[PDB]
Each structure stands twice: as C-alpha cells, then as structure tokens.
Amino acid sequence: SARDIHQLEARIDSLAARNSKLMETLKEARQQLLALREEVDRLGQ
Amino acid sequence: SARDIHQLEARIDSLAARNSKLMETLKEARQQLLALREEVDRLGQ
Amino acid sequence: STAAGQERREKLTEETDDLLDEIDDVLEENA
Amino acid sequence: STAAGQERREKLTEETDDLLDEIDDVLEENA
User: Fold this and answer.
1) Which of A15, B34, C23, D16 has the lowest tally of Cβ within 10 angstroms?
2) Measured between CB atoms, which of A21, A25, A36 is closest to D12?
3) Which domain holds residue A12?
4) How many angstroms separate the CA atoms of D30 and C3, rounded?
5) How many structural domains comprise chain D?
6) Rg (Cα) of chain B, in Å, rounded?
7) Residue A28 to residue D8, Cβ atoms within 8 A
8) Which residues in A lie closer than 8 A to residue C24 (C-beta atoms)?
C-alpha cells in the first residue's frame, strides 16, 4: 500500500515526463510543417 | 486507500491514452514532414 | 511544370493543412 | 531562382532532417 502508492506515483511522474516530451516534439513538428508548406507554395508559384 | 488507488489508476489510464494520441499524431507528422521535404527537393531541382 | 505536378503540390499542402488543424486540436486537448 | 533561394531550401531541409532524427529517437524511447 505505501509501496503501491509510491510506484503508482512514479509511473504517473514517468508518463507525465513522456507526455511533456511528446508535446514539445509535436510543437516543433507543427512549426516545421508550416515552414515546409510555405516553401512548397513559394517553389510552386 | 481503495479510493486513492482507483484515482491514481484512472490518472495513469488518462496519461496513457494521451500519450498514445500524441504518439500517433507525431508518427503522422513524421510521414508528412518527409513527404514535404521530398517535394521541396523536387521543386528546387 | 505540369498539371500533375501542380495537383501533387495541392494534394500535399491540403493534407498538411488537415494535419496542422489536427495537431492544434491535440495540443489544446492535452492542455 | 537565386543563391538565397537555394540556401533557404538547404537550411529548411537540413532542419527537417534534424527534426526527423529527433522524432525517431522520441518515438523509439517512448516505446
């Protein structure tokens, strides 16, 4: 119970960090997708 | 304790689903970034 | 420059726009 | 078509490559 609580909390901390990293990487992807779409429009015009 | 264990389990379930969604969306962004990089190289060729 | 080339760039940009809107949704829902 | 336009597309593709390798890292570490 004390040990279960502690291991449930550490799994939460872990997923929380993973989600944070995934979210950051996705915001970077968002920005680079937009920059490549603008270059594709410039190249095709 | 029963109620705590359940709430920690439901937060874990929640974060697990969020991670899954973020991961899926990032795999999609990966494929689209590659397709845009190939079009950039075709247009600048 | 060909019709097939223009159609390909339109398809790719349109898919990119659908993914940008979906990314923005994902990022706001995970807030 | 200009030297600046070529340098721009090279910068953009090289940044896209760095982000592709980082995405692959992130996706493998996740699993």
Assistant:
1) B34
2) A36
3) 1-45
4) 42
5) 1
6) 20
7) no
8) 30
Token pair, residue B30, equals: 């990966």
Q: What is the 3-state secondary structure (H, E, C) of C8-29?
A: HHHHHHHHHHHHHHHHHHHHHH
Cα distances from A26 to residues A17, A30, B41, D17, in angstroms, run 14, 6, 23, 15
Residues from chain D that touch B36, judged by Cβ atoms under 8 A, are 16
> Quick check: A36 and C1 in contact, CB under 8 A?
no
Q: Which residue on chain D is closest to A16 by alpha carbon?
A: D30
Number of domains forming the structure of chain A: 1
Take residue C30 and report the two structure tokens written for it: 């995970």
Closest Cα in chain C, distance from residue B5 (Å):
23
Nearest CA-CA partner of D23 in A31, B27, C26, B40: B27
Residue C30 has φ and ψ, to the nearest 5°, of: -85, -5
Q: Please report, for the domain that includes residue B37, its CATH number.
A: 1.20.5.170
Closest CA to A4 of A35, C31, A12: A12
Method: X-ray
In Å, what resolution does this model reach? Answer: 1.8
**Angle ∠(B17,B19,B25) on CA atoms, nearest 5:** 105
Cα distance between residue B8 and residue A11, in whole Å: 10
Cα atoms in the Cβ-side hemisphere of radius 13 Å centred on C17: 9
